[PDB]
Design a protein around this ligand. Structure first.
Ligand SMILES: *[C@@H]1O[C@H](CO)[C@@H](O[C@@H]2O[C@H](CO)[C@@H](O)[C@H](O[C@@H]3O[C@H](CO)[C@@H](O)[C@H](O[C@H]4O[C@H](CO)[C@@H](O)[C@H](O)[C@@H]4O)[C@@H]3O)[C@H]2NC(C)=O)[C@H](O)[C@H]1NC(C)=O
Ligand SMILES: *[C@@H]1O[C@H](CO)[C@@H](O[C@@H]2O[C@H](CO)[C@@H](O)[C@H](O)[C@H]2NC(C)=O)[C@H](O)[C@H]1NC(C)=O
Ligand SMILES: *[C@@H]1O[C@H](CO)[C@@H](O)[C@H](O)[C@H]1NC(C)=O
Ligand SMILES: *[C@@H]1O[C@H](CO)[C@@H](O)[C@H](O)[C@H]1NC(C)=O
Lengths: 41, 563, 568
């Protein structure tokens, strides 16, 4: 789970957090791709 | 250390008294010879100590017609042979034979890339036959021509017993050949010993000392800073990440068989870094505002170009005749050379070769730059100087007469030179011989005309000092530091006063004189004649008549007119 | 041969659910060998298959294996990793954090043909169960350039794995069966050559441009090329066309020379790239340059005069890290004429970013991009305000080169919009790329464009589906046009026919330009009647103006100057 800093970070996705990587991270949906979920198919 | 090498195939030297002196001036201090190591017509008692550091010769080595006892080429490492004497010959030793070549003593020479060996008519050499030339030659030309002389007319000692194989060059113990090809094991190109560990790098050509690629004896393609490889790094590195084009800050220039930081004068740089003598088509020689030049691409027509000797339009002819005098009409920068052979003023019947006229030589008045050599060997009794070439500024000398000279004067009736605007001699040397009328040869500042440390004057067989003192052959005191060209007061290269129309004078007529002239920073030119002469003051300032304090007849704000 | 695989740029990112990302990974990387992007094998569960990964030969970017549960990833034929992109600015092979709550993740990874990594380094961490990868040395793979920044650890806790194969030297085996050990080519090798070697013989090593071993001293018997690739051989740089000549001292034709397009050497540059003096197919030329064609193909010459400004765009140069054009970088495209890069119109720009502290984009600021004329890369449009119905911001967009494409296939991507017309009235030529129109709401007028006469590059398709429907634009407010060619219409406005019947004055068309009942008299010239000399008196039921010039009239207006009609 992410904090309140990542409210407007993910474009079309939900923020999840990794323990070992310890970086900001998004989760794209069906039909969405990219680093911050900004590109289409 | 870059010397261009001579181009004497089989002809006699122009001056035999200064030919060894020419070899001493040009072949001393050289390490990588860009041209040909040619030693022609050297008699006995010849100090050949200048051959102690020449290692790489890019062309063919020709030792011919020499009466010396030996040629010290023990430090000769590799003979590449980009140019060859005959069709398939690189190391030719001919007609050397008391005198004659006793031993060759080629110690470190173990690699000849392209060409063959021509040893013939030398009855003073012992070991020309016992040299395994297959060990020296490359694999692609293993079926080369190996003509070896047989007649010797002198029995000598056998090889030294300390080294086996019976492969020796002379009689000394350190003067026998070590094999570099047949002693190897496996697919090694060159090796130090019979062990597979002692093989060399694949770019090493003349052997190595260690297994690394930075310590060859003489590697093959392109050397820079020791580390040598197949292709020299260019100036533009093509990236494959975003398919962009980035220039290389660490990219060197291609110069012969090596790569340097920047290749020297009389080598025109290109876009690929391969600087050479002449540039290809669709290119113009421009100035890179730094003392060096670098030709680049030009516009679509690119007409108005002048060609000379040694170019596309002039290959076979050597003498300037009336058949090609139209091609040198009005051009200021001749790409090529100009040679005045003694056959250029002779009348040959049934060949349509008319001799030149003194009034026809006035077409070279606008000439300022010659890219080649100036070989003048015939001159009529019209005028005793070079006033037809009085505006010649710089001689590049990229094409040289016999590869060694740029300014050659042979058998002329010339009395003074008259080369006023000559300020820079690029390459080659200066040879004046058998000219008993030219006196002003040592008064010319030849040290300020040079651009390389390997350039010097070679004067012999000329008018001595005794025919120049009693006859009064000395110019005026206007030429400073003894730097004088001719007896006239208009041929000082640097005088302490100003210039009234390319002529050094005593004093500008500012306070005196019936006309008035304004003072320039270096020159001394006349302004408009209708300015009123100020008796005892500075009369004229500039060329426009408005800067006078008073003028002659009519006073108008722009200038002063007589009507 | 050698099917080009595109690759992804979505580092660690999960696409949908686990099964959705698995199907996207199966769809994206199927039947492809050379990966120009990034092989990113993420989010694979226990009971799934990865048999499609066997055909991948080489990856130009970085291999990113993270968060996997499967016991085997078949990266068997992965030969060489070039490493044209970095993850942590120095790393290429990052197998990181492959574990479960039972600490069961990637058990074995037999990277058998992996023999050399040119750029990047290797970091291995967080692997509880991992067979024989801890015995693999990496001095053999990674050279002495990037040896400093690499670091890895191995914590094999209760792995219960079997013994390695002692039939290979130094104990370095990838798996556990036969011929599954590392083909080491560096430490047991002679130092008589800087390249790789296939055996322990000192005189049997590879070419200088042959990387990851070879199968002979000849440059043809070679697996991959190091920097530049030749056709079935490996060279340092393939030469240009016009070389030197020792015979005629002029320019001579090439015996084996080709152009340089990327790694490989092709014979001809494509029609949208720039031919330089060095003989390499480049995208963008130098800084002090002027891109202008001379003979058919596009070239660049040295610019003279001011040499004012070139537009880098998005993705290259200064804005490589940015992902969309916004209000911050809109001031750098005011007096811009040629977009020598990419553009990204995304919904993140029209909503404001609190992370990067950017203001919301004004929709009235889209008129700054009227000045530009061409786009060398791709035009990605995924957002538009809900009031304007046409894309007139690219009205003066003449040509789209398509040097860079979105995911290597599409150039003009107008998707998820709220427009009724494309409005690209000056789109006359597209040199490369596909045009996709999908996911829109009310955008018809797309099947009557006839895109086959637009692009000339073969091997390209089109894809327009599910936008408005064929029966929804049947009404009187939605018609193509009447009395004009059916080759192309862009909107309902009459200025949108590509080719008209008689009259093509400017950007619009009419019935006819009146030579009988009209005050402007316009002579027909190539079906484009333009205005003649304004000081020419119109005739009565006669042809007034013939051609462009005052000498094409019968009666002048005010005065007569020979054949011409002048004002004074
Ligand atoms: C609106 O446009 C802006 C550009 O005009 C854009 O701003 C960019 O925001 C990015 C997200 O943070 C930045 O990555 C980008 O450049 C950064 O600038 C920093 C200095 O301020 C650098 O320190 C930074 O370097 C490193 O950053 C991270 C650290 O982990 C690395 O991931 C990165 O690779 C690099 O090593 C980086 O260069 C920034 N560009 C500019 C010009 O400021 C903004 O995001 C846009 N807003 C949107 C799209 O909503
Ligand atoms: C390759 O180039 C290097 C660099 O010039 C050569 O090294 C020089 O060799 C001369 C030989 O007398 C020395 O005087 C210089 O001092 C050397 N330079 C340096 C920086 O040490 C080298 O000889 C060339 N040839 C080979 C085969 O490496
Ligand atoms: C992947 O390619 C193979 C090759 O024939 C094909 O059988 C398979 O259906 C493809 N996978 C998908 C998901 O289309
Ligand atoms: C990698 O090592 C180099 C030393 O060559 C160092 O300069 C650099 O900072 C390191 N880290 C990177 C590239 O992230």
């Amino acid at each position: 789970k992410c904090s309140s800093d990542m409210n407007g970070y993910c474009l079309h996705g939900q923020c999840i957090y990794l323990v070992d990587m310890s970086q900001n991270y998004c989760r794209c949906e069906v039909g969405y791709t990219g680093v911050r979920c900004e590109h289409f198919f | 250390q870059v010397c261009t090498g001579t181009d004497m195939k089989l002809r006699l030297p122009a001056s035999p008294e200064t030919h060894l002196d020419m070899l001493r001036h040009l072949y001393q201090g050289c390490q990588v010879v860009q041209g040909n190591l040619e030693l022609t017509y050297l008699p006995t008692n010849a100090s050949l100590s200048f051959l102690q550091d020449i290692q790489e010769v890019q062309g063919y080595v020709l030792i011919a017609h020499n009466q010396v006892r030996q040629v010290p080429l023990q430090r000769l490492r590799i003979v590449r042979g980009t140019q060859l004497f005959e069709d398939n010959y690189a190391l030719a030793v001919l007609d050397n034979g008391p005198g004659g070549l006793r031993e060759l003593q080629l110690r470190s020479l173990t690699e000849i890339l392209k060409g063959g060996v021509l040893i013939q008519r030398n009855p003073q050499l012992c070991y020309q036959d016992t040299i395994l030339w297959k060990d020296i030659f490359h694999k692609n030309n293993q079926l080369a021509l190996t003509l070896i002389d047989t007649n010797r007319s002198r029995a000598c000692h056998p090889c030294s017993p300390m080294c086996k194989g019976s492969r020796c060059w002379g009689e000394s113990s350190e003067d026998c050949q070590s094999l570099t090809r047949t002693v190897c094991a496996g697919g090694c190109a060159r090796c130090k010993g019979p062990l597979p560990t002692d093989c060399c790098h694949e770019q090493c050509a003349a052997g190595c000392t260690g297994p690394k690629h930075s310590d060859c004896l003489a590697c093959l393609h392109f050397n820079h800073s020791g580390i040598c490889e197949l292709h020299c790094p260019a100036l533009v590195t093509y990236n494959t990440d975003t398919f962009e084009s980035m220039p290389n800050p660490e990219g060197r220039y291609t110069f012969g068989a090596s790569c340097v930081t920047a290749c020297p004068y009389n080598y025109l740089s290109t876009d690929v870094g391969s600087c050479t003598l002449v540039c290809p088509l669709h290119n113009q020689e421009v100035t890179a505002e730094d003392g060096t030049q670098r030709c680049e691409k030009c516009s679509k027509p690119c007409a108005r170009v002048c060609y000379g000797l040694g170019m596309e339009h002039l290959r076979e002819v050597r003498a300037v005749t009336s058949a090609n005098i139209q091609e040198f009409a009005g051009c200021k920068k001749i790409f090529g050379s100009l040679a005045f052979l003694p056959e250029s003023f002779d009348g040959d019947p049934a060949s349509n070769t008319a001799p030149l006229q003194p009034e026809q030589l006035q077409v070279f008045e606008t000439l300022e730059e010659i890219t080649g050599y100036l070989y003048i060997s015939a001159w009529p009794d019209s005028l005793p100087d070079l006033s037809v070439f009085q505006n010649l500024q710089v001689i590049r000398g990229r094409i040289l007469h016999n590869g060694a000279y740029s300014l050659t004067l042979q058998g002329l009736g010339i009395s003074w030179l008259g080369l006023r605007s000559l300020r820079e001699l690029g390459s080659g040397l200066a040879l004046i011989h058998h000219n008993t009328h030219l006196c002003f040869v040592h008064t010319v500042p030849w040290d300020q005309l040079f651009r390389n440390p390997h350039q010097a004057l070679l004067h012999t067989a000329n008018r001595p000092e005794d025919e120049c003192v009693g006859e009064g052959l000395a110019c005026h005191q206007l030429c400073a530091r003894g730097h004088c060209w001719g007896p006239g007061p208009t041929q000082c290269v640097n005088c302490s006063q100003f210039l009234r129309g390319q002529e050094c004078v005593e004093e500008c007529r500012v306070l005196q004189g019936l006309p008035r002239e304004y003072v320039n920073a270096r020159h001394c030119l006349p302004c408009h004649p209708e300015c009123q002469p100020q008796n005892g003051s500075v009369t004229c300032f500039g060329p426009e008549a408005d800067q006078c304090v008073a003028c002659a007849h009519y006073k108008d704000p722009p200038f002063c007119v007589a009507r | 041969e050698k099917k080009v695989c595109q690759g992804t740029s979505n580092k660690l990112t999960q696409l949908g659910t686990f099964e959705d990302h698995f199907l996207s990974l199966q769809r994206m990387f199927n039947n492809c060998e050379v990966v120009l992007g990034n092989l990113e094998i993420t989010y694979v569960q226990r009971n799934y298959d990865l048999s499609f990964l066997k055909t991948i030969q080489e990856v130009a970017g970085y291999v990113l294996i993270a968060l996997n549960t499967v016991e085997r990833i078949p990266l068997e034929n992965l030969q060489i990793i070039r490493g044209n992109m970095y993850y942590e600015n120095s790393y290429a092979l990052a197998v990181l954090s492959n574990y479960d709550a039972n600490k069961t993740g990637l058990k074995e990874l037999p990277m058998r043909n992996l023999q050399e990594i040119l750029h990047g380094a290797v970091r291995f961490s967080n692997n509880p169960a991992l067979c024989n990868v801890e015995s693999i040395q990496w001095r053999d793979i990674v050279s002495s350039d990037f040896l400093s920044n690499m670091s890895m650890d191995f914590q094999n806790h209760l792995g219960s794995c079997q013994k390695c194969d002692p039939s290979c030297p130094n104990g370095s085996c990838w798996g556990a069966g036969e011929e599954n050990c590392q083909k080491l080519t560096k430490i047991i090798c002679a130092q008589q050559c800087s390249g790789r070697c296939r055996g322990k013989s000192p005189s049997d090593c590879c070419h200088n441009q042959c990387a990851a071993g070879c199968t002979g001293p000849r440059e043809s018997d070679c697996l991959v090329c190091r920097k530049f690739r030749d056709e079935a051989t490996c060279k340092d740089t393939c030469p240009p066309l016009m070389l030197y000549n020792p015979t005629t001292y002029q320019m001579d034709v090439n015996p084996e020379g080709k152009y340089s397009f990327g790694a490989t050497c092709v014979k001809k540059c494509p029609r949208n790239y720039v031919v330089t003096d060095h003989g390499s197919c480049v995208r963008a030329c130098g800084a002090d340059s002027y891109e202008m064609e001379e003979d058919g193909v596009r070239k660049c010459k040295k610019c003279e005069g001011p040499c004012r400004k070139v537009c880098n765009g998005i993705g290259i140069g200064e804005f490589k890290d940015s992902l969309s054009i916004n209000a911050t970088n809109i001031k750098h495209f005011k007096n811009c004429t040629s977009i020598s890069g990419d553009l990204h119109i995304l919904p993140v720009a029209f909503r404001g970013d609190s992370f990067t502290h950017t203001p919301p984009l004004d929709p009235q600021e889209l008129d700054i991009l009227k000045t530009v004329k061409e786009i060398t890369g791709f035009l990605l449009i995924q957002a538009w305000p809900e009031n304007r119905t046409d894309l007139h911001a690219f009205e003066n967009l003449e040509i789209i080169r398509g040097r860079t494409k979105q995911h290597g296939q599409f150039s003009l991507a107008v998707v998820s919009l709220n427009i009724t017309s494309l409005g690209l009235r000056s789109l006359k030529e597209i040199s490369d790329g596909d045009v996709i129109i999908s996911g829109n709401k009310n955008l018809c007028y797309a099947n009557t464009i006839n895109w086959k006469k637009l692009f000339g590059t073969s091997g390209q398709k089109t894809k327009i589906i599910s936008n408005r429907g064929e029966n929804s634009c049947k009404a009187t407010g939605q018609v193509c046009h009447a009395l004009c060619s059916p080759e192309g219409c862009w909107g309902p406005e009459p200025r949108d026919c590509v080719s008209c019947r008689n009259v093509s004055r400017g950007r619009e068309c009419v019935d006819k330009c009146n030579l009988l009942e009209g005050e402007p008299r316009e002579f027909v010239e190539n079906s484009e009647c333009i205005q003649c000399h304004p000081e020419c008196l119109p005739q009565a039921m006669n042809i007034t103006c013939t051609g462009r010039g005052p000498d094409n009239c019968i009666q002048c207006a005010h005065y007569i100057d020979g054949p011409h009609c002048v004002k004074t």
